[PDB]
């Protein structure tokens, strides 16, 4: 499972820039994606009960439930994960949206830092499962999905530009950081002809 908090990611990055092997060790988070949990129906009943449990459990008031549903509908995301996100970040509104993006931003930056900066046990650790390399292409996809546009179309007659500029911004940054990771991989060459062909196609 992946910790769905921004904080461990933020602190770890701060260590670099100290690197503690322990925190870094629970590495799989640097998947860069949220492929496994998308919005789930099964999770909605769980949340609706007002009792929610993560992979302790906590009571859920109505106000929180609304923020949580806003997240899942807004970004096709699992309802419980969405809650972990609200919990981690100070509850103010929505904050949950922030943690969602900050968590991703940090992960990407760290991967970028490692792949580019170090020349190494850790880089070997990160790449070794690869796996990051499998994921890099998918990560550029996904940012691609134009759910935002669909929302925009539905919105017409009503209009929430600002919330969108905010998301479009986080994504562009993600693409940009994604660029650095790919480049870094090339400098730290992965093996053969297949990747190039795949990328050329993508």
Swiss-Prot record:
Expressed in the testis. Coiled coil: none annotated. It is found in: Nucleus membrane; Nucleus, Nuclear pore complex. It is linked to Nephrotic syndrome 13: A form of nephrotic syndrome, a renal disease clinically characterized by severe proteinuria, resulting in complications such as hypoalbuminemia, hyperlipidemia and edema. Kidney biopsies show non-specific histologic changes such as focal segmental glomerulosclerosis and diffuse mesangial proliferation. Some affected individuals have an inherited steroid-resistant form and progress to end-stage renal failure. Part of the nuclear pore complex (NPC). Forms a complex with NUP35, NUP93, NUP155 and lamin B. Does not interact with TPR. Interacts with TMEM209 and MYC. Belongs to the NUP186/NUP192/NUP205 family. Plays a role in the nuclear pore complex (NPC) assembly and/or maintenance. May anchor NUP62 and other nucleoporins, but not NUP153 and TPR, to the NPC. In association with TMEM209, may be involved in nuclear transport of various nuclear proteins in addition to MYC. This is Nuclear pore complex protein Nup205. The chain holds residues 9 to 252 of 2012 of the full protein.
């Amino acid at each position: 499972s992946a910790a769905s908090l921004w904080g461990p990611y933020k602190d770890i990055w701060h260590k670099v820039g100290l690197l503690d092997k322990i925190l870094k060790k629970h590495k799989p988070d640097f998947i860069s994606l949220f492929k496994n949990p998308p919005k789930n129906v099964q999770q909605h009943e769980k949340v609706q009960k007002a009792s929610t449990e993560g992979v302790g459990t906590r009571l859920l008031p109505e106000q929180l439930i609304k923020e949580a549903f806003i997240l899942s509908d807004l970004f096709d995301i699992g309802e419980l994960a969405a809650v972990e996100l609200l919990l981690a970040g100070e509850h103010q509104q929505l904050v949950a949206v922030l943690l969602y993006w900050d968590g991703k931003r940090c992960i990407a930056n760290s991967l970028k830092a490692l792949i580019q900066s170090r020349r190494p046990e850790l880089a070997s650790m990160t790449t070794r499962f690869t796996g990051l390399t499998y994921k890099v292409l998918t990560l550029v996809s996904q940012i691609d999905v134009n759910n935002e546009f669909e929302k925009l179309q539905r919105e017409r007659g009503l209009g929430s530009e600002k919330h969108r500029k905010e998301v479009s911004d986080l994504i562009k940054e993600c693409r940009q950081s994604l660029a650095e990771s790919l480049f870094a991989w090339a400098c730290q060459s992965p093996l053969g002809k297949e990747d190039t062909l795949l990328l050329i196609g993508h």
